[PDB]
Amino acid sequence: MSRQMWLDTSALLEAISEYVVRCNGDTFSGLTTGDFNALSNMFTQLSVSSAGYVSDPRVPLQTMSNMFVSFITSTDRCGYMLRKTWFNSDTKPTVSDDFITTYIRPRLQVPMSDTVRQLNNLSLQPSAKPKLYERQNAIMKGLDIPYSEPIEPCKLFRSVAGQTGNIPMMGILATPPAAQQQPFFVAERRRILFGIRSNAAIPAGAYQFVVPAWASVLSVTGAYVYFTNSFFGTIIAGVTATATAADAATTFTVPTDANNLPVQTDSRLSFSLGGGNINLELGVAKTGFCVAIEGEFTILANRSQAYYTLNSITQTPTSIDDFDVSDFLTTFLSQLRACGQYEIFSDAMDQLTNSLITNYMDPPAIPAGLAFTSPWFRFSERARTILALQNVDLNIRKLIVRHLWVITSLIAVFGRYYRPN
Amino acid sequence: MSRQMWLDTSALLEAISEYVVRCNGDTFSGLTTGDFNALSNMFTQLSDPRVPLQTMSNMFVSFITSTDRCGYMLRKTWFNSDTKPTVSDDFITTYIRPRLQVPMSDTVRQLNNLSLQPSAKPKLYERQNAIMKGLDIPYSEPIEPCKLFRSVAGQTGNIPMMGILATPPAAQQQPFFVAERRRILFGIRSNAAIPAGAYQFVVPAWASVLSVTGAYVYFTNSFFGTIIAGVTATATAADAATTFTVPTDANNLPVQTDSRLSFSLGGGNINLELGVAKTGFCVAIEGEFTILANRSQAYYTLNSITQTPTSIDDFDVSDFLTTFLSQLRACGQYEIFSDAMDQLTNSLITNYMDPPAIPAGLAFTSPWFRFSERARTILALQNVDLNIRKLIVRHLWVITSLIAVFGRYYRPN
Amino acid sequence: MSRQMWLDTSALLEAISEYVVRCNGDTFSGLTTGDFNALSNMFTQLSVSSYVSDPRVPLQTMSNMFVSFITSTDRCGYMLRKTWFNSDTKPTVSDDFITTYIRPRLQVPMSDTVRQLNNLSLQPSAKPKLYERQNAIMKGLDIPYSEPIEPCKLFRSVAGQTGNIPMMGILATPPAAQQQPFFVAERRRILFGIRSNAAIPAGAYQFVVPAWASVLSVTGAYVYFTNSFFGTIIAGVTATATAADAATTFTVPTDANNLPVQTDSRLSFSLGGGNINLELGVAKTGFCVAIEGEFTILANRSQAYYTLNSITQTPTSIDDFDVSDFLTTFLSQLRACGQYEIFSDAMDQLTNSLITNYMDPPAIPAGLAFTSPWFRFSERARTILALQNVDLNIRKLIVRHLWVITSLIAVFGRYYRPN
Amino acid sequence: MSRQMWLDTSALLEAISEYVVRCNGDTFSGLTTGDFNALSNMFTQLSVSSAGYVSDPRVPLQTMSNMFVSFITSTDRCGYMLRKTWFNSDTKPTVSDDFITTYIRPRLQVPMSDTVRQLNNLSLQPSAKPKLYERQNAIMKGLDIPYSEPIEPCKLFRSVAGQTGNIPMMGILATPPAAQQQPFFVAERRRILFGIRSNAAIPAGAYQFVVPAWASVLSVTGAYVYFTNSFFGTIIAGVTATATAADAATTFTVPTDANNLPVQTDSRLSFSLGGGNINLELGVAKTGFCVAIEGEFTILANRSQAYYTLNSITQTPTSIDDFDVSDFLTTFLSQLRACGQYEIFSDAMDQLTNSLITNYMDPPAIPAGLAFTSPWFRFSERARTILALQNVDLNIRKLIVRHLWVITSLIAVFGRYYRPN
Amino acid sequence: FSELRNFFTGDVVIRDDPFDVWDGVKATYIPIGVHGVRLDPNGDQ
Amino acid sequence: FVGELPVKSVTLNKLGDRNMDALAEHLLFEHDVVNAQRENRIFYQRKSA
């Protein structure tokens, strides 16, 4: 039912998984560890009740997934959750299907749960690699994400007026320069890069860099800022990494700190790219330079919405990540291939995707020009394509993407135990 | 006793550890955490709690030390079957016995392979099982490709292949497949331009079990932080698309795109097609690497090994011995053990070849805790049938780990 | 109260956090999890003696009172005196916050025992709590034998080379003639070698390991010839080699056998002991040895890093023991309610009064001027350790003491919201 | 009704056939055969009307075919079976038609039927020439086919980037070569062929072969591998089959087996071409060589989906077999001609196949360039045509071929007893 | 004790006031008086 | 009540041998009992549907 009901259940399943990994090889003979007890009780709540005793946890989990696939593949059944209103409301739909009456239903505790959540965003050491749940909440209800949760900046990257790619810029940063070019702002897995490259020298002085939309929400701690000539391992041409023992200290400054931030020092920096533009004061002329900020990157408190709401999207077409769904689908895919359905499933998904796209544009017809260049499980790409439709209003594409993601995520969670035979 | 009987206890000790690290700094006054409670009951199920752990490590060193005591664990038979042996050593009698709950325990273990977020860095136990009984490893667990590496036809090694990648080319050479910690590299270096069209690449053995999710595939010129010569990472907004395909996927996988890709190298071959000629090109796949379902056997069975001699990692053992070693050096017993182990290792190799004799040409280049090496050494004897070498490795490994696990609390006084 | 009493409550607050993380999205209705139970009972140690209903309220009140405390020097004065960092003497202090929240929390002697059993654990925490560091830095206690750390953080300034990241510019500049040996460090590897414009003969070379790397230890490492440092290209070194090249190896004072280079084998060895003895096989024009593996701090040798004994020259380059990574949330809250500025001022104050009580006679030393705010500890520690006026010892103690207070703030302020 | 309801009944009629074959010339006076018992009971299950012993099984079997032809022809009636959803979901349609009511309904015992079915894939000697029912299931539901059922490689074939076809590649293999050409991979009825043709001798050493997408499904047992120069009986030029007792051994290896497989030897082998490639090592240089694998061919486990789903198809146009439907139609056709309807049927079919494709493309209209080069029963060709429409994207094309096939088969089964009079 | 409890806990949702179940309800059709009866006509052409 | 907050709790007292309250009186120290017994009034209670 409720979009909420599905999440509460997805969360439960993710919890079951968690406690399974917690119990692996910790299930000893003479004791009932708390973790196991909890795992046991979670199994108990998964089924109906009229599902009786659980002698072998593999079965109820297996049964549940099987019913889920025969559901998520039949338009006639799972149609209800594909219409616009399912995503934007907590309206209990009038739909009868014994999969939902059995498995989907409010599972989380209120209001205690919501509260524990809020308290976590203020917690010291959040989970480094969080559950789909959190992402689901963000992408759908646009809730907040933990203040200390780290993320790889390159994911956040989106297309801007100037450079239209983070990776593509690579082939160009490696081509020697014709003359002094425009600044560039790129990101890796563990560091941010910005600078100016020229075939001629560049005088000492003050140079302004306009922090890109997508990056204006980044924050870094334990960072080292230095000059470098590589980008993802590929060599950058048209820049100098040279310096004299007694060169003129090169410093930069951000609108959030009144003190200058040093460059090329063994000091660990803390600053945020929010608030404006980085004012960089180059100590000694250089023939093209590249600054590197390498440290722990986090999304500025309370601004994760930009990323997950798909608001940081200005132009079309655009670059876009998958919010990591691929990393979670792995198992379900393996299970699909292992019983020969990877194909029959892949078909039913196009069907699901198409019908979803449909219910978003009035009048009800697959927009022309729509042709996917990838399969349902390569979201990153399909998203790009959805977002590239000139026909439909931008804000509607944005919704479609978000919606598809939630459904996709839901799959990655519920299907894992599929075994029809 | 039984091999299972040891693993069972190993697991119980790795459990003692896990819960100990859990209880650190989470031990308060009027509060009994569930973790501490478990830990406590595990301590009991084994034998202040520091004294006992100690007694146990002691008696263990004492045991694995004398070839007369642990002789049975060194026989080709102890590793081959779950047959309860006839032995009366008041160590095994006191510490080794079944501790896991059957069948439940196993059921969980499998439910785990399908788990969304398995442990990023698993316990020795999981490795022991894969290596010994040939079990499965979680489908979503990640590994660093370079560990998965074994020698193949085309090239001797992985790392060594670096110095050759640093030397300018003489003429359009042969394809190369190499791997780092977080990425896979493949291409064709040349000092003369290479036309654009279609290029068949055959995925090596070791690398045919990998699978990547959330990956960026781009053209680069670095390898382990070293410059690759005879390769150009150049292009322009005009250049035509450079796609690639794998049998597992019917569609084209784009390169040099900000798109996150997830494909699988289980098809056996990558079909790459350049859109613009390049003076040597190197494609890189950087993402999350997992080992395909049911193929993790190859790696842990040493069945992925084809040539001789070959390249071989240590299945991460080195990383677990650290604690034990540091406790050895603080006793002076570092040398004594270093030797006793040199015997333990000989004897085991012995019992694998009929007739019973230390084979021709067996000089060890490194001590017992540099397994990755000593393994290379044993996989190097051509006078002894191949398969038997592999087994000695696997077998030697298991004892090593068991040491890594039981000695830790060693304080011989 | 006593220094231990703050650490205890810190650890508790730090635990409460852990469990809150543990409970996120694992709190279902027809199901009480053992985790939630513990959390619930922990929220009871902060309440004034004893069920809650809304944990936000008490925690909020606690942070709020804390900010109000650490802000006014009159109250938190005693925590600044030279004695509070040593003595476990119940302080002559009457203050609401202290009596309402700080008190002994840990179980003795048990906790102490567990902690030790931990050092000898197979897989300790990769990202330890602040508690562990507090103990190291303050009481000089031990760190787990298997805990990994990035070498570059371990770095300190030494006779030969002044900095670690600074050398980056130098290392990328073609050489004039054969230069001296360099010992740089990255996040995941440690580098050394010699660069020249001319060739270097095949033979035996000696490298002295810096006073800071004489504590490192690696496992699962690949040692090889490379030309990059932090992604930046090193010049005056060749990586090139032929399949026919004579093997190059090296030996450590603690392992009589040779350690191969450019091999697919995974090495294990410590750097403590003495000097590295590199046996270069083929002669080459500039070489760079790279050790990329898992780094550890030798048993009972972590005293250097956390007590500041690895510091010999002035000025030195140092890290912050990571506090920066914990202040994140607290800062974010500070900016939320426009206290960021006021707090900074109050801190500069705190810091000054602190520095003060460490030098007789009682006056701020001359020439002291910070280049960064209270939360860029790496820099402030630099400046404090670079005062020609005071003895090296009193400088260190100040950095450490300043740290503990900083850490405490990072832990207690998190729930701040005045409105 | 339900697609499942049709399959179930087909299987029944297809079973009735089987037993009719069994009872032929085994119907004696005083005997009671388990076979005849089965048959006579099955004769009963047809007609919802009555259940008396059938004195003349011809009558009801006829009435049934007649009723069927009269149904399958009128698009007003059998229309519902041509919808996109009928080939997808098991949703009982709200249709009221005399035929469907009297003859279609669930008939297979559940769950037993499936149990038996799966237990079967593991059986030692499966039927060498499977009922249609099996394909119907693989083509429609994507079910597994028996692990050790044999198959002729060439059927399995599909078009690849390198070479366009299989049979046509023959003529080229005949013409002497200009110069050392690119590798070829062709397949006969009982054997697979690969090699490299050249007018000039090619060195002794290692040679890598990329096994095609269609053949990476194969696996053989009881195989003799040797050097030959014939393809379907036609002579291959630019290859030599010469050799001598002195020649060094010529071995080849596959990824699935860590051991060398000998060539031109009397030993019988078994290996899997699912490894992705063959590694051949010519012991002595040859002026053009061609290796042959002659043995028992089987489709690897959980891979038959590629063949029956049309997923092995990557190019366009493409060479495609017919899943053997042609072989089952024989009877029906000969029965049509008998009463002079071969003509009138072809016209109702063209309306069917047309009206079918229609429903497959939104918006609802015949595509441009639909040039049917062959009649309804030469399926193999009509498929190539459907799959050659550049208008509609690959997926919808494939879906139409499959859907068409199922209908085609459904006829091949029900029509046979047709006699209007 | 904590977990012993967590094992032994379950739900039962119960209406506060018991449903009032009517058994002997007598609902039978009654014909109305005499009346004009229209005989529906047969389907014609 | 459970603190200042009033609640309607299941009367374990009348559930025979499922009287979690009595089962807890088995613990060692009076305080451990009280705590458990009060925890009982928190988890075994009547709440809104």
Curated annotation (Swiss-Prot), chain B:
GO cellular component: host cell cytoplasm; host cell cytoplasmic vesicle; viral envelope; viral outer capsid
Protein name stated in the entry: Outer capsid protein P8
Family: Belongs to the phytoreovirus outer capsid protein P8 family.
Biological processes annotated in GO: fusion of virus membrane with host plasma membrane; symbiont entry into host cell
Protein keywords: Capsid protein, Host cytoplasm, Host-virus interaction, Outer capsid protein, Virion
Record flagged with keyword Repeat: no
Protein source organism: Rice dwarf virus (isolate O) (RDV)
Function: Capsid protein which self-assembles to form the outer icosahedral capsid with a T=13 symmetry, about 70 nm in diameter and consisting of 780 molecules capsid proteins.
Curated annotation (Swiss-Prot), chain E:
Superkingdom of origin: Viruses
Quaternary organization: Homodimer. Homomultimer.
UniProt record similarity statement: Belongs to the phytoreovirus inner capsid protein P3 family.
Compartment list: Virion; Host cytoplasm
SS bond list: none
Function: Capsid protein which self-assembles to form the inner icosahedral capsid with a T=2 symmetry, and consisting of 60 P3 dimers.
Protein name: Outer capsid protein P3
From Swiss-Prot, chain F:
Subunit-structure text: Homodimer. Homomultimer.
Function, as annotated: Capsid protein which self-assembles to form the inner icosahedral capsid with a T=2 symmetry, and consisting of 60 P3 dimers.
Sequence similarity: Belongs to the phytoreovirus inner capsid protein P3 family.
Location of this chain's protein in the cell: Virion; Host cytoplasm
Protein name: Outer capsid protein P3
Full-protein residues shown: 147 to 195 of 1019
